[PDB]
C-alpha cells in the first residue's frame, strides 16, 4: 500500500498497523510471564471506534484506511497475565498520511469524543502522536479573484492601499455559493464598483482560529483525563504545537528515538532570529532534550519497543478506574528476608535495595519482587529513583534516594554565541529543585490514573539551602511534594531505611500528618532523625558552658584546677597561673569533649526515640521489612476496600468513624494490630462482610 | 528604667519582651494589632479624606485556648503568652466593608524561645488555621521564627559518664556513654526513669547502664517538633484552597517557617528579613569552606522577590501591614461572599483614553491603569489608582495584579511587550561561576512567565475567589533549545490546569495590536473551561495558526505569487502571453518586494476578529475605547448570573449548569433582551429579593 510506505518514509508505523504491534507486545508479555502458555486469537481483539448516526462512538469492523478524518481510534480487549479474563483500553492516533496528521476541527472533535468515551468507562487512553500541529489554510477561492488598489497603477513599487473584488469577482462567489467567503465594503473608483476586502473568511473549514478552538478543547480534555484515567503517549513521529502540548498534558510519555516533540520548527525559529541558529528539529525536541528534562519518562528504539513499554507500564495499573490494583505474584514470594543491606562505609546503588543485586556468589534479593522494578523518568533529576515495583505480587509506586553524586550537562545555547555547556553536580541525599520536582511529579503520576499505593524510602538530609538552589526556587518544588501528598488517595508508607535519615527540612514534607487518611511512617533500627545533624545540635545546645561543666565532672585535672580557684587567700599571680592552667586544660579537652557531645546528640536521633514520641508507627529491621510490609500493605488494601464499600452505603461519615465501624465487625479475638490475621479474616469473609454492608443499612 | 524622664511610660521597660523584639529588628507581636489599626485608618484617609473614624471602627481580640483546648477571645496584658505562637481576631470597618470584616492574624513570638516551633506552637497554629477555615475568614501569618525547636535531655547532661579507652589519655577515645547506679537512682527519684534506654553491663566489678537511646522527659526536643512541622505544612496547603492566606516575613523565617511562607503562597517580605532553609554558617561548615557571608545572601529579597516566592517587598513592618490590608481590599469578607464592590470617582461610563498603536512602543500598565501625560491623565481600561501589581520582582514578561472595573474587583493578567532582562547571580559555591544577564523577547511565554501566569490564575481563584481578565497578547511559547530544555512545555501545561480549576468568570480579551497564535491560543481557549470562560478580540487584534510570514511561506509560494503577477501586472501578463506561443524573470525581480507585501496582507486579512466571529470562536469583536463600558456590564451581568446559578444549587437536588442558566434566563421578562448585559444585571439586582423569596420553595 502507498499509505503504508508514506508512513514508513516519515519514520513511523501506519496507524492501522499499530493494533498488530499491541498484539505482538501482549503475546511477548505472556511469553515472559509463562513460556508454556498457549495463546489463541481470542486473547487479543482490536475494534475500530467510529461515530454512529447520533455522533456517538461505536465499535466497528471496517476495512482499514477508510478514515475520512486524520484521527483514528481502537478499543482493545486483551487477556494479560494480570487480567487473564481481559482488560480494555482505547488507542487514539493521528494518521500522519491524512493531511500530514494535522489537527483540524474534525480530528479535535473526534479526539475529544474518544477521550470522553475512555473517561466514561474508566479505561486507559493511549495516544500515538504523529502529527504537524493545528491545520493551516487560506481562502483559495479568493486567491484568483482579489484586485490591488495601487497608489499609482503605473508604478506598483509606490505601494497599495487595500485589496478588493470586482462585481464579476462577487458574482463568481455568488454563483459558487461562496458569498460568505469575504467581508466587503462597497466603494466606486473610476466609475467602477470596488468591494474592498475588510476580512477573508473562506468557504473551506480548517484554515485558522477554528483549528485553534479545537486545540484548546483537546488540551482541556487531556488535562481532565489525566486526573481520571491512566493516560500515556507514544511519540511515534514528530509531535508539533498542540501535539507537543498533548504529550505533556497526558503526563506519561514514551519517546521513540529520533522523533521530535516541538513547538516551532528550527527553520521558522531561524527566520525569526534572522540567522542560521538551529540545524534540526531534533536539536529542539529530541530525546537528549525531553528525556533529559523529564517531559519524556522513557525512550524507545522503535515503535514496537514503545508499544512494549506501554503494555509493561499498564501491567501495574488497574483494568479501569477504582478497580483494585492488579496482583501478580511471581516465583519471588513474600516469605523471605531481604538480602542486600546497605552500610554507612560502602557506596551503594539504591536500586540494589529495591530490586536486588546480582553477585559472584549469586543473587542478593532486595525489598521488592525480583525483576519487578520498572524505572521511569530515568533520564531526569537522577538524585531520586522512581518506578513501579511489586511486593509479593502487590503493585506500587516506589521513590528511592540516589546516594551517589549526580551530574547533568546543560547544553550550550545555540542562540547565544557566549554560551558553553555546563556540568552541574548535586550531592546525594539532598533535594534540589529538579529532584524535588521529580518527587512531586512521581507522587502525582502514581496517584492519578495509576491509583497505586506508594512507598517512599525516605533518605534526605534536607533541601539544598545554598544561594543558587534558593534562587532556583527549591521552596516551590518542595511545596509541590506537600500538595501531591495531600491529594493522595491510596495507602502510603514512609520508611526511613537502614543508613537512612530525615532532618528538619526533609521531614516537613513527608510527615504522615500531611495526609493522616493514607500515610504512615516507619524507621529502621539503624535510621536517624532529628531537627539538625549532631554538628548543628551541639552548636545550638551543647555550647562551651556545657562542655566546661562536663570537663569539671569527668576530668580529674580540670576539676582539680577549678577547685584550687575556691581559695580566697591566693596571691594574684598564683591565681593567674592556675586559671591559665584551667584554660590550657580546656583547649586540650575541647576536641574529645566535642566528640562526646556529638555522641550525646546522636543518641537522641534514634528510631527508639521516634517510637517513644509517637511520630512513627513502628521501628523495623530491614531484613524483615519485606515480610512486614507485604502483610501491612495487603491488610491496608483490604481495609481501604471495605471503607469504600461503606462509603457507597449509609451516606456521609468521617474516615475515623468508617474504619472504627469496619474494625468493630472483626471477631473480638482478632488482634487489630496483626496485619496477616486481619487481611486473612477479611479475605475469608468478603461475602459475609458484603451481607453485613447490605444488611446494616436498613 | 532607661530612659529616665520620658513624658509617657517606657513601653520597652514595662514589657522587656518588646525591647527584645526591637533588638531582633522586628515589631513586638502584641504591637502588630496597632499597626493593623494604623493601616486600616490610612485606608479610610486614602478612600475619603473627610471620613471621621471612632475607636469602634477597629477591634483586635487575642485568641487563646480554653480548658477544652477551644479558641476563645480574651483581653489580657501583652507578654502573658505561655507559648511562642499568638493569634488575634480582627474586626475592622473598611471602605469595601463599612459595617465590618473579620480576619485572623497568627504570629510567632520571636521573644519566646527565639520564635521556634515546638509541638504546642504547631498545635495552636493548626487550631487557628482551622478556626479561620471554619468561619471562611482570611488567615494572615506574621513570620518571625527560628524553625523547629531544638533540644536535648537536660536531666542527662549532669549524669552521663564516658567509657574511656584509656582514662589517663582522653584523646585516645571513648567507647560509649553510661549511667552509674546512682545516676539511675537520681532519675528514679525525679520520676524520669523513661528518659533513657539503657543496657546493664559490669566492668571492674561496677554496674554500667550503657546509654542505648536518649529520650528525655521534656517535650520539644526533636522528631515531635518535626511531626508538628508536617501537620502545619499540610494545614497551610489545605487552607490556601479554602480561605485567603497571606504571610508577612517580619523577621527571619527558617525551615518550616520558610515552607509556611511558600505554602500560604501570598507573601510580603520586609527588606533585610531572610527566608532561609539552612543558615550560611552551617552551609559553610558542611562545604568545609567560607562560601557564604550572610543569611540575606541565601534568602533576602534579591533572591525571593526576584524568584516569585515573595510577591511583594516592604521597607518595614507597617509598609508590609499596609500591603496586606490593600491586597485584602479586593478580597471577599469571607469565603463565598460576593467580590467586594468599591466604586471610586472613576466611574464605568467613560471611553478608554490610552490606545496602543502598531508602530509605537507602550507599557501595558498604561492600558490597564492609565498614563499621566503633559496634557493631563489618559485613563486606561480599569479604575484610576486601582491597579495593585503583585509578583512584580519576578518574570516581568507578564504583568499580574488586582484592579477594579467600575468598582468590581478582579485579577488582571497583561503582557509586557518590551524585552525583559533578569540577572542570574554568580553561584558563590562555584569559583567558575559568573553573573548572567538573560533577555527574553516581549509577547513570548518563557518558562518563568508561563509559571507566573499559572501561579496568578491559581492565586486569583483560591481564597481570593476573584473573576479574571487576561489581556491575551502572546505570539506563542519560546520554542528554542534552551527554553525547551528548561521545560517550557511543563509550565505552559500548568496554565491549562489552572484554567480547568477556575471557579469565577473569566474574560480572555485580545486587545488592540494584540495577538494569539497556534501555540498561545491552545492554553487560553474558552473550551478549556466552558463554564467560566469567554473570549473577545479587538477589531485591531490578530489570530491565526502562524504569523503572516509563516502562512505565506507555505500557502503563498513563488508560483502562486507569479500567478498573481500574471493576473495583476500588465507588463508580467504580456511577457507570459508571449512565451505561450530570462526577460519575464526580471519583471519578477522588480515586483517581488511589493507582491510579497500583498501576499502578507492577503494572509493578514484572514487573521481578523471578523473571521473569529464568523467561525464562532469569540463571543464578540470589540472596540478598545468602548471596552470599559462593555466589560463593566458584561462582568456585572455574569457575576449576577453566577450568583443565581449558586442559589439554584440550594434547590431541587442536582441539575446541570446548562439547565440552571436556562431556568434562570427563562425568568427574564419580554422587555429584557438577554443579549443586553446592563438590562439583565439591572433586572436581576431589582428582583434578587423577589427571586430569593420565590425560590424558597419552588
Ligand atoms: C551544601 C548543600 C548542597 N547541602 N549539602 C548537604 C546538606 C545541604 C543543605 O543545604 C542542607 C543540609 C541539611 C542538614 N544539615 C544540618 O542539619 C546541619 C545543620 C547545622 C549544622 N552545623 N554544622 C553542621 C550542620 C549540619 C546540613 C545542611 C544538608
Ligand atoms: C525565538 C523565540 C524566543 N521567539 N521569538 C518570537 C517567537 C518565538 C518563538 O519561539 C515562537 C514564535 C511563535 C509565532 N511565530 C510564528 O507563527 C511564525 C511561524 C513560522 C514563521 N516563518 N517565518 C516567520 C514565522 C513566524 C514565530 C515563532 C514567536
Short mmCIF file of C-alpha atoms in Angstrom, two decimals, chain B residues 136-501:
data_model
loop_
_atom_site.label_atom_id
_atom_site.label_comp_id
_atom_site.label_asym_id
_atom_site.label_seq_id
_atom_site.Cartn_x
_atom_site.Cartn_y
_atom_site.Cartn_z
CA UNK B 136 -14.32 31.23 55.92
CA UNK B 137 -12.23 34.22 57.08
CA UNK B 138 -8.71 35.18 55.90
CA UNK B 139 -5.64 33.91 57.74
CA UNK B 140 -2.71 36.37 57.96
CA UNK B 141 0.54 34.85 59.21
CA UNK B 142 3.35 37.05 60.62
CA UNK B 143 6.56 35.02 60.28
CA UNK B 144 9.39 35.75 62.81
CA UNK B 145 10.99 32.48 63.80
CA UNK B 146 13.92 30.02 64.09
CA UNK B 147 12.19 26.92 62.66
CA UNK B 148 11.56 23.65 64.56
CA UNK B 149 12.50 23.73 68.28
CA UNK B 150 15.84 22.00 69.05
CA UNK B 151 16.56 20.45 72.45
CA UNK B 152 18.46 17.85 74.44
CA UNK B 153 17.62 15.82 77.55
CA UNK B 154 18.96 18.33 80.10
CA UNK B 155 18.43 15.89 83.05
CA UNK B 156 21.03 13.53 81.37
CA UNK B 157 23.68 16.32 80.80
CA UNK B 158 24.97 16.23 84.51
CA UNK B 159 24.65 12.42 84.84
CA UNK B 160 26.29 10.75 81.81
CA UNK B 161 29.66 9.01 82.19
CA UNK B 162 32.22 8.27 79.45
CA UNK B 163 33.73 4.76 78.93
CA UNK B 164 37.28 5.91 78.00
CA UNK B 165 39.66 3.65 76.01
CA UNK B 166 42.32 4.90 78.49
CA UNK B 167 41.10 7.02 81.46
CA UNK B 168 44.63 8.62 81.63
CA UNK B 169 44.58 9.79 77.93
CA UNK B 170 41.07 11.12 76.92
CA UNK B 171 42.29 11.88 73.35
CA UNK B 172 42.64 8.06 72.85
CA UNK B 173 38.83 7.95 72.58
CA UNK B 174 35.74 6.55 74.25
CA UNK B 175 33.55 3.50 73.66
CA UNK B 176 30.09 4.58 74.87
CA UNK B 177 28.17 6.76 77.36
CA UNK B 178 26.67 5.29 80.52
CA UNK B 179 24.92 5.94 83.81
CA UNK B 180 26.02 4.70 87.26
CA UNK B 181 23.51 3.03 89.65
CA UNK B 182 23.46 6.47 91.40
CA UNK B 183 22.58 8.21 88.06
CA UNK B 184 19.74 5.69 87.51
CA UNK B 185 18.62 6.39 91.11
CA UNK B 186 18.63 10.21 90.55
CA UNK B 187 16.21 9.65 87.58
CA UNK B 188 14.00 7.18 89.55
CA UNK B 189 13.81 9.76 92.43
CA UNK B 190 12.69 12.55 89.97
CA UNK B 191 10.18 10.22 88.11
CA UNK B 192 12.41 10.29 84.94
CA UNK B 193 13.24 6.52 84.50
CA UNK B 194 11.83 6.72 80.90
CA UNK B 195 14.36 9.49 79.93
CA UNK B 196 16.92 6.93 78.72
CA UNK B 197 17.06 3.40 77.32
CA UNK B 198 19.94 1.57 78.99
CA UNK B 199 21.59 -1.86 78.80
CA UNK B 200 23.18 -3.19 82.06
CA UNK B 201 26.87 -4.23 81.93
CA UNK B 202 29.58 -4.93 84.59
CA UNK B 203 33.13 -3.52 84.16
CA UNK B 204 35.76 -3.55 87.03
CA UNK B 205 33.10 -5.06 89.34
CA UNK B 206 30.87 -1.96 88.82
CA UNK B 207 27.45 -1.64 87.16
CA UNK B 208 27.36 0.46 83.96
CA UNK B 209 23.97 1.27 82.42
CA UNK B 210 25.14 1.79 78.82
CA UNK B 211 23.01 4.53 77.15
CA UNK B 212 21.35 2.97 74.05
CA UNK B 213 18.99 5.93 73.33
CA UNK B 214 18.24 9.32 74.95
CA UNK B 215 14.52 10.20 75.10
CA UNK B 216 14.13 12.97 77.68
CA UNK B 217 11.22 13.82 79.97
CA UNK B 218 10.91 17.32 78.40
CA UNK B 219 8.74 17.70 75.28
CA UNK B 220 10.01 19.68 72.23
CA UNK B 221 13.49 18.24 71.62
CA UNK B 222 13.33 16.77 68.10
CA UNK B 223 11.11 14.48 66.00
CA UNK B 224 7.91 15.60 67.88
CA UNK B 225 8.64 19.16 66.61
CA UNK B 226 9.09 17.63 63.12
CA UNK B 227 5.65 15.88 63.30
CA UNK B 228 4.22 19.33 64.24
CA UNK B 229 6.04 20.94 61.26
CA UNK B 230 4.40 18.39 58.89
CA UNK B 231 0.99 18.95 60.46
CA UNK B 232 1.03 22.76 59.90
CA UNK B 233 2.68 22.34 56.39
CA UNK B 234 -0.35 20.18 55.43
CA UNK B 235 -2.81 22.56 57.24
CA UNK B 236 -1.48 25.56 55.23
CA UNK B 237 -1.54 23.65 51.87
CA UNK B 238 -5.28 22.93 52.63
CA UNK B 239 -6.08 26.49 53.89
CA UNK B 240 -4.75 28.00 50.61
CA UNK B 241 -7.53 26.21 48.65
CA UNK B 242 -10.14 27.36 51.19
CA UNK B 243 -9.54 30.87 52.59
CA UNK B 244 -7.46 33.89 51.67
CA UNK B 245 -3.95 33.19 53.00
CA UNK B 246 -1.08 35.71 53.24
CA UNK B 247 2.30 35.83 55.04
CA UNK B 248 4.37 38.82 56.20
CA UNK B 249 8.10 37.91 56.71
CA UNK B 250 8.75 40.36 59.61
CA UNK B 251 12.00 38.84 60.98
CA UNK B 252 13.85 35.77 59.67
CA UNK B 253 11.71 32.72 58.69
CA UNK B 254 13.62 29.37 58.96
CA UNK B 255 12.93 25.75 57.87
CA UNK B 256 9.19 25.01 58.45
CA UNK B 257 8.94 28.85 58.64
CA UNK B 258 10.35 29.18 55.08
CA UNK B 259 7.98 26.38 53.91
CA UNK B 260 4.95 28.13 55.56
CA UNK B 261 5.73 31.31 53.53
CA UNK B 262 5.50 29.30 50.30
CA UNK B 263 2.60 27.00 51.36
CA UNK B 264 0.39 30.06 52.08
CA UNK B 265 1.55 31.25 48.59
CA UNK B 266 0.98 35.03 49.05
CA UNK B 267 3.99 36.52 50.77
CA UNK B 268 5.28 40.03 51.59
CA UNK B 269 8.90 40.18 52.59
CA UNK B 270 10.24 43.02 54.71
CA UNK B 271 13.63 44.14 53.30
CA UNK B 272 16.54 42.63 55.30
CA UNK B 273 14.41 39.76 56.76
CA UNK B 274 15.63 36.43 55.26
CA UNK B 275 13.61 33.35 54.20
CA UNK B 276 16.07 30.51 54.78
CA UNK B 277 16.31 26.71 54.97
CA UNK B 278 19.89 26.22 56.43
CA UNK B 279 21.90 29.22 57.70
CA UNK B 280 25.05 30.46 55.87
CA UNK B 281 27.42 29.37 58.74
CA UNK B 282 26.04 25.79 58.80
CA UNK B 283 26.30 25.60 54.96
CA UNK B 284 29.99 26.81 55.30
CA UNK B 285 30.64 24.02 57.87
CA UNK B 286 29.14 21.35 55.52
CA UNK B 287 31.04 22.73 52.50
CA UNK B 288 34.28 22.97 54.55
CA UNK B 289 34.94 26.48 53.15
CA UNK B 290 33.85 30.11 53.76
CA UNK B 291 31.39 30.18 50.81
CA UNK B 292 28.51 32.35 52.20
CA UNK B 293 28.84 35.66 54.13
CA UNK B 294 25.18 36.09 55.33
CA UNK B 295 21.68 34.59 55.54
CA UNK B 296 20.47 37.51 53.35
CA UNK B 297 22.65 36.21 50.52
CA UNK B 298 20.57 32.95 50.66
CA UNK B 299 17.08 34.30 51.33
CA UNK B 300 16.98 38.10 51.07
CA UNK B 301 14.54 39.99 48.78
CA UNK B 302 17.11 39.94 45.90
CA UNK B 303 16.61 36.15 45.97
CA UNK B 304 12.93 35.68 46.97
CA UNK B 305 11.32 38.69 45.32
CA UNK B 306 13.35 38.07 42.08
CA UNK B 307 12.18 34.40 42.01
CA UNK B 308 8.46 34.95 42.91
CA UNK B 309 8.47 33.32 46.38
CA UNK B 310 7.90 36.89 47.72
CA UNK B 311 5.03 38.55 45.80
CA UNK B 312 5.95 41.96 47.26
CA UNK B 313 8.64 43.66 49.36
CA UNK B 314 8.10 46.18 52.22
CA UNK B 315 10.58 48.77 53.59
CA UNK B 316 9.38 47.99 57.15
CA UNK B 317 6.64 46.17 59.12
CA UNK B 318 4.00 48.92 58.76
CA UNK B 319 4.59 49.12 54.98
CA UNK B 320 4.02 45.28 55.00
CA UNK B 321 0.83 45.56 57.06
CA UNK B 322 -0.34 48.31 54.57
CA UNK B 323 0.23 45.98 51.59
CA UNK B 324 -1.74 43.15 53.37
CA UNK B 325 -4.70 45.47 54.09
CA UNK B 326 -4.58 46.80 50.46
CA UNK B 327 -4.41 43.24 49.00
CA UNK B 328 -7.40 42.23 51.24
CA UNK B 329 -9.45 45.19 49.92
CA UNK B 330 -10.02 43.18 46.68
CA UNK B 331 -10.99 40.01 48.61
CA UNK B 332 -14.50 38.95 49.92
CA UNK B 333 -15.05 39.33 53.72
CA UNK B 334 -15.38 35.53 53.93
CA UNK B 335 -15.45 32.51 51.56
CA UNK B 336 -18.36 32.58 49.02
CA UNK B 337 -19.47 36.15 49.81
CA UNK B 338 -19.70 38.36 46.63
CA UNK B 339 -16.50 40.10 45.49
CA UNK B 340 -16.37 43.48 47.32
CA UNK B 341 -17.56 46.37 45.13
CA UNK B 342 -15.73 49.67 45.75
CA UNK B 343 -16.73 52.40 43.33
CA UNK B 344 -14.41 55.43 43.28
CA UNK B 345 -14.70 58.78 41.40
CA UNK B 346 -13.51 56.97 38.18
CA UNK B 347 -16.92 55.52 37.19
CA UNK B 348 -17.71 52.99 34.45
CA UNK B 349 -19.28 55.44 31.95
CA UNK B 350 -16.36 56.75 30.00
CA UNK B 351 -14.31 55.70 26.97
CA UNK B 352 -10.75 54.33 27.39
CA UNK B 353 -8.19 57.10 26.56
CA UNK B 354 -4.83 55.33 26.23
CA UNK B 355 -4.74 53.35 22.95
CA UNK B 356 -1.65 51.47 21.72
CA UNK B 357 -0.58 51.83 18.06
CA UNK B 358 1.03 49.10 15.85
CA UNK B 359 4.19 51.19 15.17
CA UNK B 360 4.90 52.55 18.69
CA UNK B 361 6.24 51.06 21.99
CA UNK B 362 3.97 51.05 25.06
CA UNK B 363 3.94 49.89 28.73
CA UNK B 364 0.85 47.57 29.13
CA UNK B 365 0.32 49.26 32.57
CA UNK B 366 -0.93 52.36 30.60
CA UNK B 367 -3.66 50.17 29.00
CA UNK B 368 -4.52 48.75 32.46
CA UNK B 369 -4.48 51.77 34.81
CA UNK B 370 -3.89 54.77 32.55
CA UNK B 371 -1.00 57.15 31.89
CA UNK B 372 -0.13 60.59 33.33
CA UNK B 373 0.60 62.94 30.32
CA UNK B 374 1.80 66.60 29.97
CA UNK B 375 -1.75 67.47 28.74
CA UNK B 376 -3.39 65.51 31.63
CA UNK B 377 -4.34 61.94 32.64
CA UNK B 378 -5.09 59.36 29.87
CA UNK B 379 -7.49 56.86 31.51
CA UNK B 380 -6.97 53.12 30.99
CA UNK B 381 -9.41 50.16 30.97
CA UNK B 382 -9.53 49.92 34.78
CA UNK B 383 -10.32 52.39 37.60
CA UNK B 384 -7.64 55.06 38.09
CA UNK B 385 -5.35 54.15 41.01
CA UNK B 386 -6.90 50.63 41.35
CA UNK B 387 -4.10 48.52 39.88
CA UNK B 388 -2.29 46.55 42.61
CA UNK B 389 0.59 44.77 40.93
CA UNK B 390 1.93 41.54 42.56
CA UNK B 391 4.89 39.20 41.75
CA UNK B 392 6.46 42.38 40.31
CA UNK B 393 10.04 41.27 41.02
CA UNK B 394 9.72 38.05 39.00
CA UNK B 395 9.25 37.03 35.35
CA UNK B 396 8.41 40.62 34.25
CA UNK B 397 7.34 39.45 30.74
CA UNK B 398 3.85 39.09 32.27
CA UNK B 399 2.12 41.76 34.41
CA UNK B 400 -0.10 40.45 37.20
CA UNK B 401 -2.35 42.28 39.63
CA UNK B 402 -5.70 43.13 41.15
CA UNK B 403 -7.73 46.02 39.66
CA UNK B 404 -11.26 47.40 39.76
CA UNK B 405 -13.63 47.85 36.82
CA UNK B 406 -16.25 50.45 37.75
CA UNK B 407 -15.76 49.27 41.35
CA UNK B 408 -15.75 45.50 40.55
CA UNK B 409 -12.52 43.79 41.80
CA UNK B 410 -10.79 41.27 39.52
CA UNK B 411 -7.48 39.66 38.73
CA UNK B 412 -5.70 41.04 35.65
CA UNK B 413 -3.00 39.42 33.53
CA UNK B 414 -1.28 41.60 30.90
CA UNK B 415 1.68 41.13 28.56
CA UNK B 416 4.85 43.18 28.74
CA UNK B 417 5.69 43.99 25.07
CA UNK B 418 9.19 45.24 25.90
CA UNK B 419 12.24 42.95 26.12
CA UNK B 420 12.75 41.85 29.72
CA UNK B 421 16.14 41.12 31.25
CA UNK B 422 16.99 39.42 34.54
CA UNK B 423 20.30 38.91 36.29
CA UNK B 424 21.09 35.40 37.44
CA UNK B 425 23.57 35.79 40.34
CA UNK B 426 27.03 34.21 40.37
CA UNK B 427 26.98 30.96 42.40
CA UNK B 428 29.35 31.62 45.42
CA UNK B 429 29.93 27.81 45.76
CA UNK B 430 31.30 27.66 42.17
CA UNK B 431 34.52 29.69 41.62
CA UNK B 432 34.00 29.19 37.83
CA UNK B 433 30.56 30.93 38.11
CA UNK B 434 29.78 34.48 36.96
CA UNK B 435 26.53 36.52 36.90
CA UNK B 436 24.45 36.08 33.71
CA UNK B 437 22.05 38.51 32.07
CA UNK B 438 19.10 36.74 30.39
CA UNK B 439 16.99 38.63 27.84
CA UNK B 440 13.52 37.49 26.89
CA UNK B 441 11.57 38.92 23.94
CA UNK B 442 8.20 40.54 24.66
CA UNK B 443 4.90 38.76 23.82
CA UNK B 444 6.53 35.33 24.25
CA UNK B 445 5.82 32.87 27.08
CA UNK B 446 9.07 31.58 28.56
CA UNK B 447 9.38 29.02 31.45
CA UNK B 448 9.35 31.83 34.11
CA UNK B 449 6.46 33.92 32.61
CA UNK B 450 4.37 30.78 31.88
CA UNK B 451 4.91 29.72 35.56
CA UNK B 452 3.91 33.28 36.69
CA UNK B 453 0.74 33.20 34.56
CA UNK B 454 -0.37 29.80 36.01
CA UNK B 455 0.56 30.99 39.53
CA UNK B 456 -1.53 34.18 39.08
CA UNK B 457 -4.56 32.19 37.81
CA UNK B 458 -4.31 29.91 40.90
CA UNK B 459 -3.87 32.81 43.37
CA UNK B 460 -6.90 34.75 41.97
CA UNK B 461 -9.02 31.56 42.12
CA UNK B 462 -8.17 30.10 45.54
CA UNK B 463 -9.09 32.22 48.57
CA UNK B 464 -9.39 35.50 46.62
CA UNK B 465 -12.29 33.92 44.54
CA UNK B 466 -11.95 36.72 42.04
CA UNK B 467 -13.12 36.84 38.41
CA UNK B 468 -10.28 37.38 35.93
CA UNK B 469 -9.37 39.22 32.75
CA UNK B 470 -6.45 38.13 30.63
CA UNK B 471 -5.32 40.74 28.05
CA UNK B 472 -4.06 37.93 25.81
CA UNK B 473 -1.10 39.07 23.75
CA UNK B 474 1.33 36.22 23.10
CA UNK B 475 2.93 35.21 19.78
CA UNK B 476 3.46 31.77 21.37
CA UNK B 477 5.86 29.88 23.64
CA UNK B 478 9.67 30.05 23.37
CA UNK B 479 10.42 27.01 21.20
CA UNK B 480 14.22 27.37 21.09
CA UNK B 481 16.63 24.79 22.53
CA UNK B 482 17.39 26.49 25.93
CA UNK B 483 13.74 27.11 26.83
CA UNK B 484 12.60 23.67 25.59
CA UNK B 485 15.38 22.11 27.69
CA UNK B 486 14.22 24.38 30.60
CA UNK B 487 10.79 22.68 30.36
CA UNK B 488 8.60 25.48 28.86
CA UNK B 489 6.03 22.69 27.97
CA UNK B 490 5.58 21.86 31.70
CA UNK B 491 4.93 25.48 32.70
CA UNK B 492 2.61 26.06 29.76
CA UNK B 493 0.61 22.95 30.78
CA UNK B 494 0.19 24.43 34.33
CA UNK B 495 -1.83 27.25 32.63
CA UNK B 496 -4.36 24.76 31.22
CA UNK B 497 -4.68 23.05 34.66
CA UNK B 498 -5.09 26.39 36.44
CA UNK B 499 -7.91 27.35 33.95
CA UNK B 500 -9.73 23.96 34.31
CA UNK B 501 -9.84 24.60 38.12
#
